[PDB]
Design a protein around this ligand. Structure first.
Ligand SMILES: CC(=O)N[C@@H]1[C@@H](O)[C@H](O[C@@H]2O[C@H](CO)[C@@H](O[C@@H]3O[C@H](CO)[C@@H](O[C@@H]4O[C@H](CO)[C@@H](O)[C@H](O)[C@H]4NC(C)=O)[C@H](O)[C@H]3NC(C)=O)[C@H](O)[C@H]2NC(C)=O)[C@@H](CO)O[C@H]1O
Ligand SMILES: CC(=O)N[C@H]1[C@H](O[C@H]2C[C@@H](C(=O)NCCS(=O)(=O)O)[NH2+][C@@H]2CO)O[C@H](CO)[C@@H](OS(=O)(=O)O)[C@@H]1O
Ligand SMILES: CC(=O)N[C@H]1[C@H](O[C@H]2C[C@@H](C(=O)NCCS(=O)(=O)O)[NH2+][C@@H]2CO)O[C@H](CO)[C@@H](OS(=O)(=O)O)[C@@H]1O
Ligand SMILES: CC(=O)N[C@@H]1[C@@H](O)[C@H](O[C@@H]2O[C@H](CO)[C@@H](O)[C@H](O)[C@H]2NC(C)=O)[C@@H](CO)O[C@H]1O
Ligand SMILES: [Zn+2]
Ligand SMILES: [Zn+2]
Ligand SMILES: [Zn+2]
Ligand SMILES: [Zn+2]
Ligand SMILES: [Zn+2]
Ligand SMILES: [Zn+2]
Ligand SMILES: [Zn+2]
Ligand SMILES: [Zn+2]
Ligand SMILES: [Zn+2]
Lengths: 276, 273
């Protein structure tokens, strides 16, 4: 119960703002599995740097959504481990977008999947769905964020079955003792290790890319037959940047999508007035 | 039902959109207490009409917040019964804003209360706090929205103590069997009755005030303490309308960084401020 309710506008950078809402640091065990993931980040330092530079487009939005819901701000780092904040990322299980929704879970959250539009890549739709899913999982596991994260990665069924197996054997049923697939064994310590580094990067000899505490994009209502090319030309925008903000459109063809477009803040007023 | 933003253009108005996200209709009992509240609304029809006219400023925002959290859209009616969608409404217990936060609960959610600023009246801050509170209450009562609503009105402690009392007596512990203060006895059936009317207004001989399924306002960044009078003059806005959208400011001086403005002036004010 650290509710900010809109005073976090005063923070200079996004990292400080994120740190303000961290909720999982108090209870971090010193399980060696966390140390193991911490070393991975230190020895692959370009991973966080590249994720941060891409993340600069999206992180402000993610942070504000988490704050509004009073959810742990460590979850603003979840796309780092899921997708390196690359919304075009696609796993071999066909997990898609920043939040790595598989097709069936995406479908459950009404993240539409056509040949030209994939709602799982849509920044705003996918983020709100992911936070809703995470909240639901947390509720299903009696408020335990470790089990919720495990279930996000492995599925609620897998985690529940692991719990019941341990109950029958007379083993403890906390996340750390569950016999989960290796990916899920690594998943939670990975997030915890990364959050420790983000909390105190100096202490690991790391420097984070400065990211300002300001919105990068604004949603603009548009018409049906307006191409990204046309919007780019109209506002003298970099078409690559527009695509990175609107990655749901495969082949950059604006078909099959909602009548909303994310545009850079500095051109938002012009495009609002021009298109709407 | 999880809501996608592609359904939105097809909705006629906000009432259709609201109904789409209703989650509490399936399990509404036919307890006489609900019928009793339903009759009150039918015999005092101006109540919902006045609430709807005020609500036209705010309802779209509330609906979108509820959708993105997959929370019951019946909760978009909670400000009707709490405040008639009037953010200046103030109970004798000093419950304030659309969502009627009392001082201590407001404080808990960091809704600041000075002689010049009351965060409880702030549309976006109060709404997000209320939804968070409601979600937390729902979680505390094992997903039961009846108990959550009762707790919103009476407090978590009161409801928990009523449940424990019934357990010891060997009574069921569902909302309907708790002997709560009369306000809280009426509170939940009031919301359910109103949602039934909104769900099928034809069936009660009611026609709801048309409200478009479009945003009324947009948030605009301001980096300084500007007067709302100055903003109103700059954009040729009615100062009253600006105040209704930004009711937290007693002194209208701001100083106390986001400002809600009518959609049609949003681009101009974004560029100007
Ligand atoms: C002489 C005469 O008869 N004059 C008529 C006026 O009475 C009438 O004004 C309206 O009257 C009704 C009372 O029947 C009143 O309804 C009340 O509205 C408030 C909300 O503002 C509710 O209070 C909230 O209740 C919840 C609990 O459920 C609390 O959690 C919340 O904190 C309370 N909020 C506040 C601010 O106190 C009351 O419960 C509700 N009473 C009910 C449903 O019985 C209307 O507000 C009055 N409206 C106005 C504009 O005054 C008028 C019609 O407008 O007609 C006159 O003739
Ligand atoms: C957000 C999301 O879609 N989560 C789903 C998850 O995806 C995981 C899968 C993982 C992934 O794609 N791993 C494969 C990596 S590799 O390409 O094979 O190396 N990434 C996603 C988010 O963590 O898979 C499990 C299990 O199917 C699903 O549980 S279910 O309810 O039982 O279906 C769960 O819903
Ligand atoms: C959102 C909110 O602030 N809810 C609070 C609620 O307010 C209620 C009070 C009621 C109200 O103002 N009633 C009095 C009306 S009258 O003017 O006296 O007739 N309206 C508000 C929202 O439902 O009062 C209870 C009990 O104190 C609080 O529980 S506590 O945890 O035990 O403090 C609860 O937090
Ligand atoms: C398969 C692989 O090596 N992917 C790279 C990993 O670092 C990482 O993989 C992601 O692992 C998550 C579990 O920790 C999965 O939930 C997620 O789906 C998976 N993502 C992808 C695209 O395979 C991510 C980004 O860090 O992709 C690669 O970079
Ligand atoms: Zn709290
Ligand atoms: Zn803080
Ligand atoms: Zn669901
Ligand atoms: Zn919950
Ligand atoms: Zn919790
Ligand atoms: Zn069990
Ligand atoms: Zn819907
Ligand atoms: Zn629920
Ligand atoms: Zn006026």
């Amino acid at each position: 119960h650290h509710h900010s309710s809109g005073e976090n506008l005063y923070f200079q950078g996004i990292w400080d703002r994120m740190r303000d809402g961290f909720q999982l640091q108090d209870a971090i065990s010193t399980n060696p599995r966390i140390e193991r993931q911490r070393l991975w980040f230190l020895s692959n330092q370009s991973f966080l740097e590249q994720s941060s530079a891409r993340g600069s487009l999206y992180m402000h939005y993610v942070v504000e959504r988490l704050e509004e819901r009073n959810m742990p701000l460590e979850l603003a780092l979840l796309p780092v481990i899921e997708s390196a904040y690359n919304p075009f990322a696609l796993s071999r299980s066909n997990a898609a977008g920043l939040w790595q929704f598989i097709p069936a879970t995406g479908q459950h959250f009404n993240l539409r999947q056509t040949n030209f539009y994939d709602g799982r890549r849509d920044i705003t739709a996918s983020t709100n769905a992911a936070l809703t899913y995470l909240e639901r999982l947390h509720d299903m596991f009696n408020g335990d964020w470790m089990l919720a994260l495990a279930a996000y990665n492995a599925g609620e069924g897998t985690v529940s079955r692991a719990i019941e197996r341990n109950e029958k054997l007379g083993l403890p049923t906390d996340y750390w003792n569950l016999p989960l697939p290796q990916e899920t064994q690594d998943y939670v310590p990975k997030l915890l290790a990364l959050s420790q580094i983000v909390m105190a990067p100096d202490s690991y000899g790391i420097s984070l890319n400065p990211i300002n505490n300001e919105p990068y994009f604004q949603a603009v209502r548009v018409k049906r037959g307006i191409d990204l090319s046309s919007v780019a030309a109209l506002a003298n925008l970099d078409e690559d940047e527009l695509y990175q903000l609107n990655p749901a459109y495969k082949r950059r063809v604006t078909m099959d999508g909602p009548q909303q477009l994310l545009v850079p803040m500095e051109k938002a007023a012009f495009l609002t007035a021009s298109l709407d």
